[PDB]
Amino acid sequence: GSHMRKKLKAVLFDMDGVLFNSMPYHSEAWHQVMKTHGLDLSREEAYMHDGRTGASTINIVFQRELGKEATQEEIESIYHEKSILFNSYPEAERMPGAWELLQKVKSEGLTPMVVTGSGQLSLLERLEHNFPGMFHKELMVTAFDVKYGKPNPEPYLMALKKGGLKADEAVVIENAPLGVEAGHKAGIFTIAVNTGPLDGQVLLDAGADLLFPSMQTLCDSWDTIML
């Protein structure tokens, strides 16, 4: 009721496909790097790995394709090449609606947080430049913070702890099924934003409490939702 909305203290955003329009790039880079290394990973499957750490993504692709674990050397080497390729494209731009929403969130007195499986320093160091005054490194969870990462609730549990928050004081904004699942398993109200080429149903099946087709529509409906 009025209780749910009034409990809110923080809004926890994924980065890729939520704040930055970076998913076409990640999909392309993952596909290409695996191809060079000798492994089949489609752009569609690469999309569906959104949320995981680079290390987890690589290990899981190795499991699925070769039926074995990647070594640490393979993880480091492939991740380096993935990063070179990703950074070779014209730098990813803001997702339309993201900045407008963040302004609404801040004006409501809520704390923005980033919870991401990313270790891409280019993107992470561009958060301040793209969303000025919004985020703080002490109020972010990245690949550097976690042992497991999404879909494990771990990164979202860590975010609640960093923010001094209980689960009912936060909302999660996610584009990815594995990220929705992590937020849901951490016990947090989760809003799915279907910014990729996915069936919106898979985000609902992952445990999303609300579904929107874009960040802009979420932004437009922000004052309306949660009673």
Side-chain angles (χ1 to χ4, degrees), residues 1 3-5 7-227:
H3 187 76
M4 168 194 282
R5 192 65 189 255
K7 269 262 206 174
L8 252 67
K9 291 187 173 171
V11 183
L12 285 43
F13 297 81
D14 194 32
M15 178 174 68
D16 292 301
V18 170
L19 301 174
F20 286 111
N21 181 30
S22 54
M23 289 312 300
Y25 289 172
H26 287 295
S27 294
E28 191 71 28
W30 273 127
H31 165 79
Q32 291 295 334
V33 72
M34 283 312 173
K35 180 176 174 175
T36 286
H37 207 94
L39 291 86
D40 288 329
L41 176 66
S42 70
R43 298 169 176 86
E44 285 66 41
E45 284 165 329
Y47 195 99
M48 286 292 284
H49 283 308
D50 189 48
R52 306 191 194 276
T53 64
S56 177
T57 298
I58 291 156
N59 195 51
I60 287 167
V61 170
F62 269 64
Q63 291 174 356
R64 301 190 181 161
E65 301 302 311
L66 301 177
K68 67 200 219 290
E69 305 280 294
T71 64
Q72 178 67 15
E73 175 269 292
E74 281 165 337
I75 290 168
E76 307 266 356
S77 305
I78 291 168
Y79 186 72
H80 185 277
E81 281 318 306
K82 193 253 154 142
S83 297
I84 294 291
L85 289 165
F86 176 83
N87 282 309
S88 81
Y89 313 137
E91 75 184 358
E93 298 196 325
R94 294 179 293 279
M95 184 68 75
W99 171 242
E100 202 191 336
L101 180 57
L102 274 163
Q103 284 172 292
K104 282 184 157 153
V105 162
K106 199 184 186 183
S107 289
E108 201 177 311
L110 305 166
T111 303
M113 297 189 74
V114 177
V115 184
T116 178
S118 191
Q120 282 310 318
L121 296 179
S122 74
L123 293 179
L124 291 168
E125 295 183 357
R126 279 178 70 222
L127 287 165
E128 181 53 40
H129 301 307
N130 284 267
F131 311 103
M134 293 295 172
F135 302 117
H136 300 282
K137 63 168 201 292
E138 299 89 358
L139 291 167
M140 290 171 52
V141 173
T142 69
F144 304 112
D145 297 303
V146 302
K147 300 201 192 306
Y148 313 115
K150 305 170 195 183
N152 191 312
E154 182 198 28
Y156 281 110
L157 300 171
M158 287 177 172
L160 295 175
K161 194 138 99 209
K162 281 192 196 291
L165 302 151
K166 299 187 268 84
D168 63 359
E169 304 179 311
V171 162
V172 166
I173 318 296
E174 276 282 359
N175 68 117
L178 298 165
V180 167
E181 180 182 356
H184 174 80
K185 285 178 171 180
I188 312 164
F189 191 99
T190 300
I191 301 173
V193 279
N194 197 16
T195 62
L198 296 183
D199 184 353
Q201 189 51 49
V202 314
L203 295 170
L204 291 171
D205 296 339
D209 295 290
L210 294 167
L211 174 65
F212 290 93
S214 69
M215 287 293 284
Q216 192 55 67
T217 52
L218 174 55
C219 185
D220 292 339
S221 320
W222 183 253
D223 308 291
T224 303
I225 59 157
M226 285 186 281
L227 274 127

